[PDB]
Amino acid sequence: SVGEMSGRSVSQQTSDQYANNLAGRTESPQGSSLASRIIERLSSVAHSVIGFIQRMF
């Protein structure tokens, strides 16, 4: 019981080089683009969207 979760024994483990590197993963940002585009307030909703919407909303 104590020292366990998901019916499995838990223990601390020293993180390796790959884990330490993946943990700090960053991605260079992309320049702006929203301001330079045709933006409009949706006048209607697609068919596949209504179902999806009403299905999980």
Partner 1 sequence: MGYSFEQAITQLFQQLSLSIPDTIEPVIGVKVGEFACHITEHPVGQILMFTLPSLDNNDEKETLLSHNIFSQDILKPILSWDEVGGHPVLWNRQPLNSLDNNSLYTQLEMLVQGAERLQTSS
Residues that bind partner 1 (CB under 8 A): 2-3, 5-15, 18-27, 29-30, 32-34, 37-42, 45-46, 48-49, 51-53, 55-57
The least CB distance from residue 16 to partner 1, in Å, is 8
| Cα 15 from Cα 5, distance rounded (Å) | 20
Cβ 11 to partner 1 shortest distance, Å: 5
- H-helix or E-strand spanning residue 4: strand 4-5
DSSP state of 5: E
CB atoms within 10 A of CB 26: 5
Nearest approach, Cβ of 36 to partner 1 (angstroms)? 10
